[PDB]
């Protein structure tokens, strides 16, 4: 999986992810990805926009081919890595581009 990625922080909390993102300036596009503490099969994209940290739920789905989506399968991604790389170039449903990785 994208578990080798620096922007992936595993099972950290919403409140910690907001601390990490804040500790790096609260600039638009600052982001990380975490495992959800509420939706066990899901992930969360935590993103800074307008000095606020917002959280985008990412759920898996399957005709037996797995994919990830933030919009009930209207836009679909093979993996978290593709999802992250796509939104570094395209806004999609996000308020701004994924710019700077909040590392660790």
């Amino acid at each position: 999986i994208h578990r080798t990625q620096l922007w992936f922080h595993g099972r950290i909390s919403r409140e910690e992810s907001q601390r990490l993102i804040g500790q790096q300036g609260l600039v638009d596009g600052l982001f990380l990805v975490r495992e959800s503490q509420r939706n066990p099969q899901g992930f969360v994209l935590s993103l800074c926009h307008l000095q606020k940290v917002k959280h985008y739920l990412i759920l898996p789905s399957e005709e037996g081919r797995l994919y990830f989506s933030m919009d009930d399968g209207q836009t679909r991604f093979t993996d978290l890595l593709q999802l992250v790389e796509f939104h570094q170039l395209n806004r999609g449903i996000l308020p701004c581009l994924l710019r700077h990785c909040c590392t660790r």
């Binding site: 919009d71 209207q74 999609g92 449903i93």
Partner: peptide, 8 residues
Amino acid sequence: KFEGXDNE
């Protein structure tokens, strides 16, 4: 998008 809005 539009506020309160599912348009994308």
